[PDB]
Amino acid sequence: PISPIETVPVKLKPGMDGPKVKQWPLTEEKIKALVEICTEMEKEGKISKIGPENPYNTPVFAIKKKDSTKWRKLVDFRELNKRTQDFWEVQLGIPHPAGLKKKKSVTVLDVGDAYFSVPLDEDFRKYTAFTIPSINNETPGIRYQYNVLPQGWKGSPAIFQSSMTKILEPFRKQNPDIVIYQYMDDLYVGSDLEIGQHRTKIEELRQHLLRWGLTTPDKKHQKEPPFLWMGYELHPDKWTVQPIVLPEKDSWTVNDIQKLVGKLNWASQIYPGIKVRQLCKLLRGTKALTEVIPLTEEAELELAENREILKEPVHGVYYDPSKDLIAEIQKQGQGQWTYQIYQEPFKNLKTGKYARMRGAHTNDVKQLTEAVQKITTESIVIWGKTPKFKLPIQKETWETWWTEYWQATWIPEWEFVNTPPLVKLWYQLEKEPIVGAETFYVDGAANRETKLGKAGYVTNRGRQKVVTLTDTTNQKTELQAIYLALQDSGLEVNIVTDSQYALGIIQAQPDQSESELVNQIIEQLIKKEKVYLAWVPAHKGIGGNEQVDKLVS
Amino acid sequence: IETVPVKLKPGMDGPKVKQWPLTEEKIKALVEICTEMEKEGKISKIGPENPYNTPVFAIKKSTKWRKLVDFRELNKRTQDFWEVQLGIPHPAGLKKKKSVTVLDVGDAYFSVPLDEDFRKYTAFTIPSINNETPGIRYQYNVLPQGWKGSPAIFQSSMTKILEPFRKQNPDIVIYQYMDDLYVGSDLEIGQHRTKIEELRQHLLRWGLTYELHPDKWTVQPIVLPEKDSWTVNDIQKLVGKLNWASQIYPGIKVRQLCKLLRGTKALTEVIPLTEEAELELAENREILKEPVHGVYYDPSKDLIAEIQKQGQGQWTYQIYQEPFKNLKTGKYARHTNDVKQLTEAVQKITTESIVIWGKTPKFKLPIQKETWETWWTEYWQATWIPEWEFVNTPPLVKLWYQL
Ligand SMILES: CCn1c(C(=O)c2cc(C)cc(C#N)c2)c(C(C)C)c(=O)[nH]c1=O
The missing domain is CATH 3.10.10.10 (HIV Type 1 Reverse Transcriptase, subunit A, domain 1)
Structure with missing residues (x-):
């Protein structure tokens, strides 16, 4: 019609x-x-x-x-x-199974010749x-x-959807008890009536659809659960992703590894602890899809660990609006995080993964907060309310962090949970200069065209030391000079620099970095007892700055 | 109509x-x-x-x-x-008033x-x-x-509504901005409040059912400590701070002070203050107290606002059109909730901005985009929204505007 x-x-x-x-x-x-x-x-x-x-x-x-x-x-x-x-x-966004309420009765109705x-x-x-x-x-x-x-x-597609919405509107006004999802030329209908009064409400719906041009499947031509839909398997009181088969291969091509990562990522919606760091590393660089990439040892370990998690099937449950959501997060290792969201432990609504780095240098407290934030947004989308969190960090560790960090923050209601590895702070710069601690006035400097650098320092005990660096930037030398003062100093040391850049980095208490240098400085800052870091204006003739500034050129 | x-x-x-x-x-x-x-x-x-x-x-x-x-x-x-095309003129007398009441007239529209x-x-x-x-x-x-x-469209209906009240109180300044009416006078506070009720009644016949004190508004000057014994570290922090000021305030001098920092000294060392350093220091403190010489409001330009988190519930801010040429600097304080406070500071700053310039600033916000995106709405009470972006504060700047 x-x-x-x-x-x-x-x-x-x-x-x-x-x-x-x-x-x-x-x-x-x-x-x-x-x-x-x-x-x-x-x-x-x-x-x-x-x-x-x-x-x-x-x-x-x-x-x-x-x-x-x-x-x-x-x-x-x-x-x-x-x-x-x-x-x-x-339609911007599509429903996630984890957000559906459990229903006594569900019917699928696909519109014939929709357009x-x-x-x-x-x-x-x-x-x-x-x-x-x-x-x-x-x-x-x-x-x-x-x-x-x-x-x-x-x-x-747009005019169709709006037509269905206008046509459905009245049946919705009269039938609040009944749920209807519009997806493309489909209707998904559910209620908590017993077969009869449902089968009855369906025919009404259909018949309403018919007065309005829209033909639909009859009782005999309505598909039955489990429904397969957009990569999911939707059963009456549970759901999971559709079956995933990791291919056995002697030789992996870029294309094979991409598809593998995609399947893993998809699986991680409900399979806890999937990882893909070591596989993704392989994809780095520039090759064709046809190219074979040898699996590294850590990638080989990763595929194995995933292979075992996928072994036995897992499923998720549906959403009960009358209970709270709890979200748990664990550190999985090097910048990797995993989470689970449940309402009754430990039957997960869903699970997930978090990796992204924000910047070149961060620490676990920053990363954990980014994952809390990512999980909060997603939960508002799927359920309309924020979860209650259980985090692998002491309350006192977190408040030490928040109070002394310069960026504002605030995670919603959370509790400590003892699920190691715990997130901690690995060193803390001093808040005041250290009496009886040698003061290193450090400085770096590179020639713009040459790329030649020289990092040094001077101290108040008269030590001095310059070293040459090759192919270095005017700001790498400033970090070297600091690394230099760290490895020649005692367990306590004050360091004076004129590099805001270097100051900014260290002052944020990084515990991991893309930079080798910064990774070295970090290993040092941890070895120490006390480090105080100070900043001075360059070329103002200040104190020991003048001296070490002269030494580098 | x-x-x-x-x-x-x-x-x-x-x-x-x-x-x-x-x-x-x-x-x-x-x-x-x-x-x-x-x-x-x-x-x-x-x-x-x-x-x-x-x-x-x-x-x-x-x-x-x-x-x-x-x-x-x-x-x-x-x-x-x-x-x-239909701009609404901003009164410069508004910011001079003893009291300003903000009324929501958004129902008018x-x-x-x-x-x-x-x-x-x-x-x-x-x-x-x-x-x-x-x-x-x-x-x-x-x-x-x-x-x-x-407001641009409704303004001439607004002029009619307010005309009697204006005629009867010629010393009262009324300014419309977005959904709001800003009402300023120099009356004693009970009389001012009486006048506001009188105004509400006028508004009330046309279907339109807190207190600022702009006088009390004064600089948050960059503050040079007044200390007992000075360390190398202390003077070093003092020079850095004054070195910052000198980008902003013409006349800031540092020589006499850094003369003190001579050689390669230990940070914790106590060094006595020169006759000259103490005069320099004093003459600089004079300068920071006053407004910036050479900086002026350009009405064609956008306003910018930076906020630093100072800790302990204190927040500093500066307003400028070109970086470092400060038109205003200030402080907001007192939640163990960072986002609640930040939200308060932005609304307060925006409000002062509207009173002074008739413009809302674009904010540089010391917070992760997504956090702010998720939470600002839990605490927001204003009817407008400034433009904002998200920034990592230079640890230096925060230190130079501390109190
Ligand atoms: C059985 C899954 N389910 C469903 C449902 O059957 C469904 C859901 C979607 C999004 C797609 C498809 C298909 N094909 C089916 C609904 C319906 C009534 C929304 C519901 O409420 N609660 C619920 O547990």
């Missing part, structure tokens, strides 16, 4: 006019097939015969469907689409004109225009 | 800012609110043929949820209309119809949890709150 629902007014982009492409001449079998299709469509109202004056045209083609002897009408809307107005996004079942703005139809060419194009062709939403036109 | 044609700035198109995820309780509050405004004909449900979108949020003022539409983009895109051809640009979306349904989409049929066009 074609829905009686009022049409959505459509227009072209303001500067523009509708397409006027020329019809490519087509073979005889194709012209035949197109005529057969169009005549059938025309008799259902889908399209109408026109003749010029209508100036517009969009090319039509016919393809031979798979191996079968069926033909299909393909229309190339490229130009009309470029000239058609933008619409609002159809062709919805009218097109009368005033817009004329821009959809296409022409079936005569044999070798010797005579005038047969011209139609759409009365309904064309396949492949820009506005179709 | 006859509507006012509204033109976007030529070329550029309307807003298409995505909606942020909202919690269930805020969504529900928004549905109620919007179902009611639709009954009252202020908004209407819209189709997919409307490409545009601006964000909406719910704030809690009172224990009544309120709707806050984020028109930052639209305003930026309509700026020719509300600023150059719901009675004036919005230009038919402009309505599509006010589109917004109420989201749904887990994307169960498509958003609920509306646009405005009347002057929306949050849009800088609404």
